[PDB]
Write an enzyme that holds these catalytic residues in place. Structure first.
Site, PDB file in Angstrom:
ATOM      1  N   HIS A  94       0.841  -1.187   0.000  1.00  0.00           N
ATOM      2  CA  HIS A  94       0.000   0.000   0.000  1.00  0.00           C
ATOM      3  C   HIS A  94       0.883   1.247   0.000  1.00  0.00           C
ATOM      4  CE1 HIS A  94      -3.359   2.633   1.769  1.00  0.00           C
ATOM      5  NE2 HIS A  94      -3.711   2.332   0.539  1.00  0.00           N
TER       6      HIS A  94
ATOM      7  N   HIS B  76     -11.678  11.411  -0.501  1.00  0.00           N
ATOM      8  CA  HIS B  76     -11.047  10.244   0.110  1.00  0.00           C
ATOM      9  C   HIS B  76     -10.049  10.682   1.184  1.00  0.00           C
ATOM     10  CE1 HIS B  76      -7.231   7.789  -0.238  1.00  0.00           C
ATOM     11  NE2 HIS B  76      -8.001   6.838   0.286  1.00  0.00           N
TER      12      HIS B  76
ATOM     13  N   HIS C 220      -9.688  10.266   5.561  1.00  0.00           N
ATOM     14  CA  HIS C 220      -8.613   9.645   6.322  1.00  0.00           C
ATOM     15  C   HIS C 220      -8.231  10.518   7.521  1.00  0.00           C
ATOM     16  CE1 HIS C 220      -7.113   5.838   4.453  1.00  0.00           C
ATOM     17  NE2 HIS C 220      -7.723   6.280   3.373  1.00  0.00           N
TER      18      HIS C 220
ATOM     19  N   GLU D  19     -10.905  11.397  -3.930  1.00  0.00           N
ATOM     20  CA  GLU D  19      -9.608  11.301  -3.306  1.00  0.00           C
ATOM     21  C   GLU D  19      -8.796  12.510  -3.690  1.00  0.00           C
ATOM     22  OE1 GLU D  19      -6.731  10.633  -5.545  1.00  0.00           O
ATOM     23  OE2 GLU D  19      -5.463   9.308  -4.310  1.00  0.00           O
TER      24      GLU D  19
HETATM   25 CU   LIG Z   1      -7.091   5.425   1.550  1.00  0.00          CU
HETATM   26 CU   LIG Z   2      -4.503   4.002  -0.341  1.00  0.00          CU
END
Ligand SMILES: [Cu+2]
Ligand SMILES: [Cu+2]
Ligand SMILES: [Cu+2]
Ligand SMILES: [Cu+2]
Lengths: 657, 648
Positions: free
Chosen positions: B206, B363, B367, B348
């Site tokens: 990731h 997005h 977070h 995002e």
């Molecule tokens: Cu994410």
């Molecule tokens: Cu990600």
């Protein structure tokens, strides 16, 4: 691999069947690849032309997508990208070539198609496909003069070339002189501009510009290039600036625009070209021809003059309103940044136009109207005159009138933009204290011009002519080499980056008075634009004429950019007075962060996504003057400089060296 | 040259000053390069370690741009590329390193900066520069586990590693076992997914994916990769497909999305990580925490929950409308081809978004909200929880809920696309008649999984610890090697090229029947995709598990790609039923004329990502077994887990 070099053989002798053998090679074509006319005697042929060939290129038999649409256009017909129907045929063919899986199959598809479709069309469709495929990059495409000389040369030579090639043995062949100043006598004052209108160089530049920036096909197939709208505005706008310059050097006034389409067109033009592909000649236009409603059923043209007038009326409205309307009904604003770019796509009509249906196909349709005055309803079964083909459009004087009008429309937007403030075009610290030019064996601040013969091999283009060399002698304007010398002071204490922007305009008007800014700003022709690093204190910058970013070398054009020999206006024998202008702008503001290849992708290139200058095209002079400014000499800021130059012509023919 | 190898020494012991000597070398740091703390005692220091070094690397004194902005971030502070302010700092530093043209001045700039800026930030800024300069190419950057073990390991081990390294002589040092299933007990059913959420492998994948496809980066060249929007959609979409699979193998239901942000978050998560760079621990999130409006004046975050909700409302509208609007006011249409890619950049927020101002930074901002529930106005002077860092975000269960929601939004677009026609996914002539799998010492059509300890040298990352080796023992899921065997008939008379596309999903529902397509299509995890040449007549294709184009080798992770040991779901001890699916598509259509060779040019498949199953079924189709065309095949597989620890 070889394949790349084998495609270039398709450009060889466009009307000679592909099985006749090109250069030092020959194709080994399947029998199902032979045309219906020749297939029934295939055995006799492949053998008959197999001789004298070093290499033999094999070709694998594929199915091949339907070529109905590509083949719809007759073989002995003319091809123009302005005609609605041809556009749809090309886009079909380009789609076949620009969707061909392998470089083997591109070659196979091509070899089959070549002898079934219109040569002019084939050449175009292939060009573009090769030009914009990801495994045929860096390819040296043959000059279209060499493949289609009929669009660039008085028809008279062709029967001389045939005679010379048949009678005289190779090696002893005399170069064929190409007639210049041959379309009109001295009774027509327009004939003086032959060296510009009819110059091979500038006609090639125009053709190529439209190759790399088409207005129809697919956005990934090259339509959506950065600021192509503004490009279309500026490039064409510079054509007329340069034309108007050359006019003043031949004791003529500035080109008059096409005010209104109902009034006659004073200046006729018979181009003297004979299409060997159509086997006919291009029609001429008579004096005082009038534009007429078109009804060309075959070509798919049903347009009335009022349609054109309606488009113009609407475009003017939008420009004054300050915004346009998209198909959806929403409003888009013609701002300082993207306004010009939008307008360009609207006016030419590129699929990028935010509302083609409303604002029309104004520029292109104009080219067709003007080219069909002699036969608008097709009752005489005649093809379009020279203004109907991009390849030849610049030869006609009316081109500059129509393109002059179009420019006035753009101007109508530019005069709405806010004047550049003293601040905006000052470079704090930098001061240009002088610019001069020096040619070998000539006073300072003096440019010279003259005539010059050059030679071109038209051998690959001469179909069914005894093989060998066929050199043609072109006479064209040329200038003595020179260099600029620019004195710049830093007075900052740090290395300053700057853009050098060099334009040149006439000094006075047609009546002999020192020109005002409002007038002169529109006559400034760009001469160079390059990046420079300045050390603290004093800097002496020197720049050669041949380093110009407006120009491309001799070798590139003959053996996409503006021809080098046409960089300098002609001037007069008695000398023509001109203001040379330079500006150093702050490159930090003008900079375009980008990764760039810069290797003769015909000028460095600019085929990379973005255009390398944030400022508007024609930046110092695109907008009106700020308050108080009246002439160039009080428009200037410290970081600019003016210089009186004198342009001298000499009527003599130098060799090419 | 050497220079390339000398930069790699910067990654060694990130918090130890650069003059302390890395590996078997040391830098000859000028006296004016010593920090204000250490400069006044340069004499005693320069010649502390001055003898005991094989090489001595010289460093030329250059100008060095102003490093104010890079140094604005504290040294004992956490980083995060999600936080608006950090983005501006990193992107500026990246710009400095990137802007030193010569490879020797890059070494000089680096050596100076290294001990003045935040280690986490330095590591990122350097990593990005090296990976995307031309002179520093193919350079093997040390695993971020080895340089920053604190983001990958229970804090408990650190005081054991310090003890072991100080007390016991080298060579006699015992490997330190890394605790597994340590974040929660069995009262929390979520604890079962430790082997996925907290696996080193998947967390590295990731982190690295976001390295090579950033969404914000000075110069829009490295941000503008082919179909990175669609990539962002698909990659994250596959994370949840794989997660949902692993859920079913632990007697859990599919992950519930974050339907609405006002309702509490049921699942808390205390990550048990201690940042040795911040010298603090990451905060936990309690059960039933609620998202709260952020006002982090320092970090430059002033966002209300309603802002987020507004972005979502607008994005949904666009998706249903079928088009978006750019800054200019023009409309761009979410078509079959580029629609998904656009939407990805919008959601995002990558600078490629056609209108960031309107559709927001949906997005990323999510977070941050989720990571700051414990201290949203900074009154408690606490840092962000684990969801605030890409490196650690996947550890938290809420990650999958938030990413589940986001996926539903993408889906809302995909269900508008026209169903693939029988024609479109038929390969005229080609017929797949069967696919099977075989593992050594195991029945046909049977996959096995288990636990496996592996070792990693965390020595380079252990600052101010007695030098030597420090091996750590990770326990992680592993599968027995296997291979696919595919029977394909040509019946054409010519060599046919084809793409082999292999996915795997669960077989049945909760009621014990064949899953329906509408459901099952979203649970298919890609297992392989490779090009194959088929001879006329019959062809027996064989493909090893380790040849997978979804996966990268062991050696790369431990010493971007999904970890190899995580290729197969866990399954159950009693066996977990699964449908293995293969499709052969016509490579001529799928071909793109230009883990999978060198990455830097194009995505080599014209078809949409997740291509067989990204869209809804055509009329009449109802389940997989009637979705199939001749050029596809289905096979019942059984996934067996065994709770044992095998060696390597
Ligand atoms: Cu994410
Ligand atoms: Cu990600
Ligand atoms: Cu043109
Ligand atoms: Cu034109």
């Amino acid at each position: 691999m070889n394949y790349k070099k084998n495609l270039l053989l398709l450009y060889d002798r466009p009307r000679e069947p592909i099985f006749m053998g090109k250069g030092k090679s020959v194709f080994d074509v399947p029998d199902n690849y032979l045309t219906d006319r020749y297939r029934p005697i295939g055995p006799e042929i492949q053998n008959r032309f197999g001789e004298l060939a070093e290499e033999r290129i094999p070709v694998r038999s594929i199915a091949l997508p339907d070529l109905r649409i590509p083949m719809s256009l007759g073989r002995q017909e003319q091809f123009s990208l302005f005609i609605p129907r041809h556009r749809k045929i090309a886009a079909r063919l380009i789609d076949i070539f620009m969707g061909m899986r392998n470089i083997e199959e591109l070659q196979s598809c091509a070899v089959f198609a070549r002898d079934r479709i219109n040569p002019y069309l084939f050449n175009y469709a292939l060009s573009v496909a090769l030009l914009h495929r990801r495994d045929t990059k860096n390819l040296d495409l043959p000059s279209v003069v060499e493949v289609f000389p009929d669009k660039y040369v008085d028809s008279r030579v062709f029967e001389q070339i045939r005679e010379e090639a048949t009678v005289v043995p190779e090696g002893m062949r005399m170069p064929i002189v190409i007639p210049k100043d041959f379309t009109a006598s001295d009774l027509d004052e327009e004939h003086r501009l032959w060296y510009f209108r009819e110059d091979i160089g500038v006609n090639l530049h125009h053709w190529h510009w439209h190759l790399v920036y088409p207005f129809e096909a697919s956005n990934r197939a090259i339509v959506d290039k950065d600021r192509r709208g503004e490009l279309f505005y500026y490039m064409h706008s510079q054509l007329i600036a340069r034309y108007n310059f050359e006019r003043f050097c031949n004791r003529l006034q500035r080109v008059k625009r096409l005010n209104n389409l109902r009034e006659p067109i004073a200046e006729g033009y018979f181009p003297k070209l004979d299409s060997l592909v159509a086997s006919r000649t291009w029609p001429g236009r008579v004096d005082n021809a009038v534009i007429k409603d078109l009804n060309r059923e075959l070509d798919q043209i049903k347009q009335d003059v009022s349609d054109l007038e309606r488009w113009i009326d609407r475009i003017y409205e939008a420009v004054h309103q300050g915004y346009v309307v998209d198909e959806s009904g929403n409003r888009i604003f013609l701002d300082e940044e993207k306004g010009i770019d939008i307008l360009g796509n609207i006016i030419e009509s590129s699929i990028l136009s935010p509302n083609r249906q409303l604002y029309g196909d104004m520029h292109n349709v104009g080219h067709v109207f003007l080219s069909y005055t002699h036969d608008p309803d097709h009752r005489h079964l005649e093809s379009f005159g020279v203004m109907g083909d991009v390849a030849t459009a610049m030869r006609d004087p009316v081109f500059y009138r129509w393109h002059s009008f179009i420019d006035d429309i753009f101007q109508e937007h530019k005069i709405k933009l806010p004047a550049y403030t003293k601040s905006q075009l000052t470079y704090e610290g930098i001061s240009v204290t002088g610019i001069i030019v020096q040619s070998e064996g000539a006073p300072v601040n003096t440019l010279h011009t003259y005539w010059q013969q050059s030679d071109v091999d038209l051998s690959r283009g001469m179909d069914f002519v005894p093989r060998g060399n066929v050199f043609a002698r072109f006479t064209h304007l040329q200038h003595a080499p020179f260099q600029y010398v620019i004195q710049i002071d830093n007075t900052s204490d740090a290395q300053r980056m700057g853009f050098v922007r060099i334009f040149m305009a006439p000094k006075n008007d047609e009546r002999g008075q020192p020109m005002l800014f409002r007038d002169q700003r529109l006559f400034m022709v760009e001469m160079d634009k390059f990046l420079v690093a300045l050390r603290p204190g004093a800097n002496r910058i020197r720049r050669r004429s041949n380093e110009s970013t407006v120009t491309i070398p001799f070798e590139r054009t003959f053996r996409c950019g503006w021809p080098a020999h046409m960089l300098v206006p002609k001037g007069l024998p008695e000398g023509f007075p001109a203001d040379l202008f330079v500006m150093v702008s702050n490159y930090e503001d003008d900079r375009v962060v980008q990764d760039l290849v810069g290797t003769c992708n015909d000028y460095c290139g600019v085929r990379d996504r973005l255009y390398p200058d944030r400022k508007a095209m024609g930046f110092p002079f695109d907008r009106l003057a700020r308050t108080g400014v009246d002439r160039l000499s009080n428009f200037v800021t410290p970081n600019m400089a003016i210089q009186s130059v004198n342009v001298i012509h000499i009527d003599k023919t130098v060799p090419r060296t």
